[PDB]
# Entry
Amino acid sequence: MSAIYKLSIQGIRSFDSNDRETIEFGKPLTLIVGMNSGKTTIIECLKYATTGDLPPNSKGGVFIHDPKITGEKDIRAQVKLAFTSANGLNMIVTRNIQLLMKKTTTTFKTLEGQLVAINNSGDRSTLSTRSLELDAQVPLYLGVPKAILEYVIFCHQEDSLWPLSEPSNLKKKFDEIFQALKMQDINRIIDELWKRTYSGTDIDTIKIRSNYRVVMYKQDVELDMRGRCGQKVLASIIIRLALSETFGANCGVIALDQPTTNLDEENIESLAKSLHNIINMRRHQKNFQLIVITHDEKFLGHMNAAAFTDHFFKVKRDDRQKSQIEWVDINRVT
Amino acid sequence: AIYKLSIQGIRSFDSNDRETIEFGKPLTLIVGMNGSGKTTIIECLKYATTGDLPPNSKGGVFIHDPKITGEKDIRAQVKLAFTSANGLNMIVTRNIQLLMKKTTTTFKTLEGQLVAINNSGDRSTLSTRSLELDAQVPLYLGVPKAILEYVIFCHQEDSLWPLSEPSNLKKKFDEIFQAMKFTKALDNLKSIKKDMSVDIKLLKQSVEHKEWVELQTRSFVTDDIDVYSKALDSAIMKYHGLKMQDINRIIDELWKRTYSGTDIDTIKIRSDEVSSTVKGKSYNYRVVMYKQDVELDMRGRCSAQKVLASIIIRLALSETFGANCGVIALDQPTTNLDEENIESLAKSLHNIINMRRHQKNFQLIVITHDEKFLGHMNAAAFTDHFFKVKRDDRQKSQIEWVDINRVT
Amino acid sequence: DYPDPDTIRILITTDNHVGYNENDPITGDDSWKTFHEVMMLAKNNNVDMVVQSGDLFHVNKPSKKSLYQVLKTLRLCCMGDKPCELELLSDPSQVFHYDEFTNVNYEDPNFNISIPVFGISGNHDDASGDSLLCPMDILHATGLINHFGKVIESDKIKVVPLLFQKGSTKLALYGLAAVRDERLFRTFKDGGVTFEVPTMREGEWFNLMCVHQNHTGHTNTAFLPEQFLPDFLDMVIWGHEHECIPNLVHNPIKNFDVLQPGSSVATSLCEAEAQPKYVFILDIKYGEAPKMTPIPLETIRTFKMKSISLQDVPHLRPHDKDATSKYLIEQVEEMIRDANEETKQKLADDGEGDMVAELPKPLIRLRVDYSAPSNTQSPIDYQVENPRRFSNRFVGRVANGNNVVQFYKKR
Amino acid sequence: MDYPDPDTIRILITTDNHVGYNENDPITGDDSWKTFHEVMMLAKNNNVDMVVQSGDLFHVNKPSKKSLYQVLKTLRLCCMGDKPCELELLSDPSQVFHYDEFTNVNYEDPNFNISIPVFGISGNHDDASGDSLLCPMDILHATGLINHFGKVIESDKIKVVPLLFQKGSTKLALYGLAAVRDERLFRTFKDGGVTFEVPTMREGEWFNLMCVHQNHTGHTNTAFLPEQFLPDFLDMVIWGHEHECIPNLVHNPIKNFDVLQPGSSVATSLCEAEAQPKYVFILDIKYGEAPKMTPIPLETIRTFKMKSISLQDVPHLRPHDKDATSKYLIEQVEEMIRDANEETKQKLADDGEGDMVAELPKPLIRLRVDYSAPSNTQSPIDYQVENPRRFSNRFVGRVANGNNVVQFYKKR
Ligand SMILES: Nc1ncnc2c1ncn2[C@@H]1O[C@H](COP(=O)(O)OP(=O)(O)OP(=O)(O)O)[C@@H](O)[C@H]1O
Ligand SMILES: Nc1ncnc2c1ncn2[C@@H]1O[C@H](COP(=O)(O)OP(=O)(O)OP(=O)(O)O)[C@@H](O)[C@H]1O
Ligand SMILES: [Mn+2]
Ligand SMILES: [Mn+2]
Ligand SMILES: [Mn+2]
Ligand SMILES: [Mn+2]
# Structure
C-alpha cells in the first residue's frame, strides 16, 4: 500500500473554523487516545474529501461547525489532504464545502477543488477541478475500492457492526467490491484469528456462505447466528480484518475505531495477539499503519505499545469547545 | 416485581434440563463471555411477561436448535415467578414447541398455565388462552404492554431508540398508547355526554304541550357532564404537562452528573404539540442539542453524546411513567465510553439505586464484563453474589452462583 | 523529644489513598506527597509505631508510582539503627497466619527496623484476586509493613491481636479488614465473632482496634452500630470516612473512645472535604489518661466550599444564558480570590516572603441547584453550563478545573 | 559445595525469571514463582558470593499482586544471613545508584544483613512505563532486596559505569546496560554515543563483566545488537532476552571474551526453542587462572514436550477427514503424554523417594499443526481440524495446560 501523510480538518466537527489543525501518522501503527473529542470523526475526514462521503443521516451539512455556536453568519470547512500516493506522487485536493446561510435558510453547495500532483522538488502540477472527477480520480490513484474505505478501512464508530444485519443489503453490497466464484479465500483468513483470539469453546469457524450471513459452525452443522448471536462485534472485526487483507491495497491498511467493544478479560488480553501477528507477518509488506482509536487500558497494555511507536496522537478539547491535538510520547500513557 | 425464571430451551440453553435464576433486590448482575447467553435471561424475562419473540428472532429459532441435539420434536418451558402488583404470586409458566419435519418445521406455541398462587398454594389456573396471556400479564404486573417491550426490558440489538430516530420512530413508541388509551375514555365520555346532550331535548319537548313532573329533573345533568369533558381534557393536558415534563426534569438532572460533570450544553425532548387537523390534540417528539441558547438537530450530529444518554432517556422515563414496579433491564451500559463517563455513570447509577430504596423495589440487571465498570458499580456494598453464565463440555450454558468474594 | 522510658508513641493515619488522581497534571502527586510528609513527620517525631486504618491505597491493584513512592518513603523513615523498644508478647504466627512470615519485621534478625508500620486492609484495596491478596500483604513481604487483621471467612470472624510490651505498658491491636457491611452485620447478629482477651493481669492492658466500615450509613442495614463493639475496648479508629474531626467521640455506656482521623487526599469534592485535615499522635501510658496531639497536614491544596440556591435569588429568569452565567461567575471568581489569598497567607507568613512566593492553585466547589421555580411548571428550566464551558474556561487559575461548580436539582 | 577458596569469587547467573506468567491457569499458575524460589534455594546452599541476572524478572511492566508477593517472599528470608559478603566495595557507588539517597550497594547499608547480593538490569518486559518513568526493579530496589544498575536516562547519551568489588587479590569489574529498544541502541552505536569508563588503576588484573539484554538474531534487517560491537577489554557477557538456555560458552576469536546465554526459567511460549532444559550457572572466578563454570540443573520446572507436526507428514489423511485427523492427533498426544509421564516418574524417582505413589505433576504439552494441502494438488479445501480449545478440552485432568494444548497454524 501507500501511506497517507496528512489531511486538513479545518473547521469541521469540533476543530475550530479559525485555525487549521491536522495530526500526523506513524508506522507501522498510528495510535489514538483520549476521551469520547475529535477522534471518532478524524476517521470521517479521509473519505469525506476523497469520494464525497457525507455521514448517513445527514443532509443539512451538520458536520461543519455550526455558526450559531460561534456566533456569525458565515462558517465553513476545508479539507486539502497533503498525502502520499502509489509511486510517491503526493497530491493535494481541497473540498470547498460551506455552511453559508440565506435569509433564514441553510443552503448547501460546493465549489471547485484542485488536482495538484506534488513534485519531489516542488514543481507541482494540477489536472482538473471537477468534484465528480475528483471522486473518480482520488480513488483511482488512492487505490482501495470505492466501497471499502468507507466500511472496511475507515468505518464509523457504530457502523462497525455492519455484517450482522440481514442478507439483502450485504448481498447487494458485495457486488461493488466485485465491481460487476471468486470468493474462496476471504473465509480462509476468517478463522485463524477466531481460533487464536476468540477464546470461545462453542464454535469452530464462521463462513460467509451464499444469503450472505454469519453462519456459525456447531459440530460441522451451521447454527446460524443471524438472530441467534460480543461474538457479533468480534466476528465483525475479523470480517474487516480479512477484507482489508485480500482485495485492495494502496491506502492506509486498517482503521479500527474502537474494536474492543463488549469483550472481557480472557478476550481483551487475547484480542491484539492477532493484530501483532498481522503486523509481524505483514511487516514484510512494504507498508502498514494500524490505526486504532481506543481508550482501553487493558487492551493497550497487552500489545506492548512501548514496543512499536514513540507517540500516540492524543486528542483533547480547549476552553472554547475546540478540540486541539497534542503530541505526547509513548511512555507517558498509564 | 420479578422473582425467578427457568429457561428450558430458549437460545443456547438445552431442552432436556431447566436452569433457574433467582432474582434478588435491588440488583442481580449477569456477567459471562461472548456466547454464553448472559442477555438471554433478560430476553426471556421479556418473553415470559409479554409473550413476544425478542427482536430479529424469525424463522422459528428461539428454542434450542434440534440439529445441535438431534431430537425431531424439540420443546421448551419458560417459567417466570413474579409477585403481581395486586399481591398475587403468579407463577406464569409458558410453553414453546417446535415440530420439525423432514425439511420444514412448524413453529407452534402451546398454552401455559397462568396461576395466582396465594398463601395456601391453591393452584388455580387464572387463564389458559395462548393469544391472551400476552395481553393479560401486563395487567397483573401494573404497567402497559409497550413499556415492557421497549423500556422495562430492552434488547441490545434494538436498544437504540432514545437518542435515535425521532418522528419516524421515537413517536411510534409514545403514540401507540396513552394517546390511544385516554382517547378511549374521551370517546366513551364524548358519547356519555351525547346521550345526555340529547336528553335535554326530551325535557324541552315536554313543556311544548308525567312529562311536567319529571320535566326539569336532569336539565342540569345535561351540563353536569358538559363541564366535565374538559375536566378530563385537563386531566390529559395537566397529565402530559407534568408526567412528560417530569421526564425532562430528570433527563436534565440525570445528565448533569454523568460526563465528568456533563456533556453537550443541555438536551431535552421537544414537546411541541403539533395539533394537526386529523386528531385535534396531538404530539410530535424530537431530541435536539441546545448548544448556547437555541436548539440544534441532534440526529446525524452526535457520538456514542449519544448512547451515554440513550440510557439516560430510558432510565428517566420509566421512573415516573411506569413507576409501580421498578424493573429495568439496563444491560451493557458501558460500550464506547471513555474514562469518566464510566466512573461518574456508575456514581450516577449508584445514585439511582441510592434513592430508589425508599420505593417498593428497584430491579436492575447489569449485563457486562468490563472489569472497569464491575469495580465501578461497587457490588461490595449491595449484593452478596453475582451470576455467571458459561458453556460446558457439550456447549450447554449453565448459570453459576459465583460469590462476590472472588471478584477483584 | 524522646518518649519517656515507659511511653509508647503511635501515629494514627487512615485513608491516605496513595494512587488517587494519578494522571491529572496540575494535581497528580498530592496523595503520595502527603503520605511522604506524614511519614517524614513520623521519622522526626520519635514515634515508636505507625498504625493504619486501611484504605491506604486508592485502587485494589495499585500503580507503580504509588508503590515506589510508598516503599521509598518507608525505607527512608522506618529503616534505621535505633533499637525499637517494643517487646513482643504474642506469637505472631497466629496473627500473620497467612504464610511463613510469622515474625514482625522489627523482630527480624536481618532487618534492624526502627519504626514498624502495621495496618488493616481497606475497602478500595481489599483482599482481591485468585489468592485473596492485598497490597498491604505485598508490603508485608518487603519487611516494612505488618499487614494484620486479615479475615478469611465472612461467617465466622476470629480477630487475633498482636501484643507488644514496653516498660510497664501493654498493647493490643485487633484488626478488622474490609468486609461488606451487611455481612459483618449478619455475623454480628448471631454472635459469629469472638474477641481473644489475654487472661493474665486484668486491667493492665490497652486494647486498640482499627475498623473500616461506615459509621452512620444512608442504607437501612448497611452501617456498623457503635454499640455492637464490646465493652472491653479502650479505643478504636474509624476509616472509610473522608471527614476529619480532631476531637474524640466518648461513649458513656460502652466506655470506649472513637476517633475519625479522616483522610490525607481529598477524594470526592463535597462538604466532607471542606474541613481541616489532620493526622494524629497518641502517647499511651498505663495508669494515666491517653493524650492526643493532632498535627495539621501542610501539603494539601486549599479547599473551601459553598452551597447556595440558584432559584432563590431574584432576577433569575430561567430562559437566559447571558443573565445567570455572570451571577455564577461572580461567586466562583470570588471564592477563587479568597482561596488564593488564604494560600498566600499560609505559604508565605512564615518568614519566607521577601519576594512574592509561588502559590499552589486551590480546589473550589460551588453547589447550586438549577431546579424548576417553586410556583410554576414551566417546560424549560435554567440553561446552565457544563465542565466544558464553566470549568474548562478556568484553565491556569483553579486546580479543580473540571468540577468547579455543582449542578443538581433537589428532588 | 563448600565455601570457595578465600581468593575465589563465586557468582550465579540467572535470567528471565518472568514471575507471574499465566497467573490464571489453575495448574500452571504457580510454575514461575516456584521455579524462582528453587533458583534462590539453589543459591543459598551453594555458597555463592553474588547473583547477577540479565533482566525480565516480571512478565509485564505492571506485574500482578501475586508476582510481587512471590518475589519479595523468595528474596527476603533466603538471602539475608549473618555471614558477611567478603566482596569489599572500594569505589564510590553514589553514581551507579543515583536515583535517590540510596547511593550504595545493599550489603553496605547499615540497615541490611544481606549475606548474598543480586545485581539485576531492567528488561523490555518490565521496562519503565506509566507517568513517572518507573520500572518494577526500581520498586524492588526501593525495598533494597535487589540492586539495580544499567538504567538509562537518555537513550542517545549512554554512560555505562562499572562497579568494583574486592576480596583477596581478585578485582571484579561489572558493566551493565539495561534493556532499551534495539533500534535506539544501534543508533547510539553508529555514532559512538556510548562511554565505557575503565578504571585507571592496576590494569591487567580486573575481571571485566557485561550483562546485555538484547536480541541475538533478528529476522528483520538491522534490529538487533551484533556481537562485534562490544569493546575489546571485556571478559564475559550475559545475553538476556533470548529464552533458549545453553550450558557452554561460545568463544570469540577477536573480542577477548566468550559469550553466555543463560536462557530463562519458565516456559512462556510453548515453542521448539523452549524444550531445552533450564539451568542456573555458577562461575568460580579467581586471579591466576581461567575461572571455571559448574552449571547446575533445576528440579522445579514442570515437564514439557513439543512436536510441531504438519498433517502432511503422516500418510493416510484425506482432506475431508475430521474424525480421522482428530483421532491421529489424539493418539500422538497419547504417546507424548506417556513419554512425558514416564520421564517425570523417573525424575521424581531419582530424588530420594521411589515408594510414595502420591501424584505425578501434569506435563505441559504443545502441538503445532500446519494444516495445509500440498501445493501440487489443486483441491481448494484444506486439512480440516477441530476447535483448538475443545480439541484439547478432552485432555483436562491429564495435562497441565487444559485449553491451549494445540495451536493450528499455517506455514507454506
Ligand atoms: N437460537 C439459538 N439456538 C442455538 N444457539 C443459539 C441460538 N441463539 C444464540 N445461540 C448461541 O448462544 C450464544 C448467544 O448468546 P447471547 O444472545 O446472550 O449473546 P452474547 O454473547 O451473550 O452477547 P453480548 O456479549 O453482546 O451480550 C452464541 O454462542 C450463539 O451461537
Ligand atoms: N454543531 C456542532 N458543532 C461542534 N461540535 C459539535 C456539534 N454537534 C455536536 N458536536 C460535538 O461533537 C461530539 C461528537 O463527536 P464524535 O462523534 O467524534 O465523538 P467521540 O468523542 O469520538 O465519541 P464516541 O466514541 O462516542 O463516538 C458531540 O458529543 C458534541 O460535543
Ligand atoms: Mn478512604
Ligand atoms: Mn474506606
Ligand atoms: Mn525472558
Ligand atoms: Mn528480554
Remarks:
- Chain B touches chain D through one residue (CB under 8 Å).
- The longest strand of chain B covers residues 105-117.
- Residues 182-197 of chain B form the longest helix (16 residues).
